[PDB]
């Protein structure tokens, strides 16, 4: 049975997400205009989006039950390492299998392989990233399941530099158990089948995607011509 405490967690995470995720995408107007023409032409616009998207992932993280208990240094570690992965997870909403792109309501804000390529990331990242989006889409998660996964991704005990791992591990265990119990009670078969395992496999895919991004991000960022075009927050969080 799904406890009251467990049900409470889901209510909070759903709200948290609704406050941090705007399906209308109205704020993209604020970003530096996209350019599809031109090397790195998409970089300024996406750089802004990512920074915006980081800020929103931070706001989501804060509302996670038990996140506030951690030390700041631990708080910071978890965000720094999770941020890209959580962004990749969030983007599933905008992502459509119709044309393998992130569709944010308009051609200007619809993003494809080419646009990501124009932002200075290679296909070594993108093909496996796109494959992830398809595979996560294919799961057709309940919005309840989606928000829990993102939260589970942020509070991971094995992130490097975590002081108080046992607490981080306890916070996460509590969310895993909420997801696991949710799937049983509220996800009917056949969608239920192996669903928890398949979700954790996505965390595994994300670790790898994180790796590759870091690698490609260091290559972008070492050229100061490029670092100039990014936002200061993006510099802070990615390095």
């Amino acid at each position: 049975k799904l406890s009251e405490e467990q049900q409470h967690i889901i209510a909070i995470l759903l709200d948290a997400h609704h406050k941090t995720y705007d399906p209308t995408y109205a704020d993209f107007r604020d970003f530096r205009p996209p350019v599809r023409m031109s090397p790195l032409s998409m970089l300024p616009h996406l750089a802004d989006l990512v920074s915006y998207s980081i800020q929103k992932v931070i706001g989501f993280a804060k509302m996670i039950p038990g996140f506030r208990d951690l030390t700041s240094d631990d708080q910071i570690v978890l965000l720094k390492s999770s941020a890209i992965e959580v962004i990749m997870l969030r983007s599933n909403q905008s992502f459509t299998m119709d044309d393998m792109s992130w569709d944010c309501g308009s051609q200007d804000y619809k993003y494809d392989v080419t646009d990501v390529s124009k932002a200075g990331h290679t296909l070594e990242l993108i093909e496996p990233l796109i494959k992830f989006q398809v595979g996560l889409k294919k799961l057709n998660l309940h919005e309840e399941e989606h928000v829990l996964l993102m939260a589970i991704c942020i509070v991971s005990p094995d992130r490097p530099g975590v002081q108080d791992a046992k607490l981080v591990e306890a916070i996460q265990d509590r969310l895993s158990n909420t997801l696991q119990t949710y799937i049983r009670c509220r996800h009917p078969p056949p969608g239920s089948h192996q669903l928890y395992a398949k979700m954790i496999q996505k965390l595994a895919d994300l670790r790898s995607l994180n790796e590759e991004h870091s690698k490609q991000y260091r290559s972008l960022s070492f050229q100061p011509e490029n670092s100039m075009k990014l936002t200061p927050l993006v510099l802070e969080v990615f390095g």
Partner: peptide, 10 residues
């Protein structure tokens, strides 16, 4: 060493 990240978490 993370003024912005820290400030956003505060």
């Amino acid at each position: 060493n993370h003024p912005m990240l820290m400030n956003l978490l505060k």
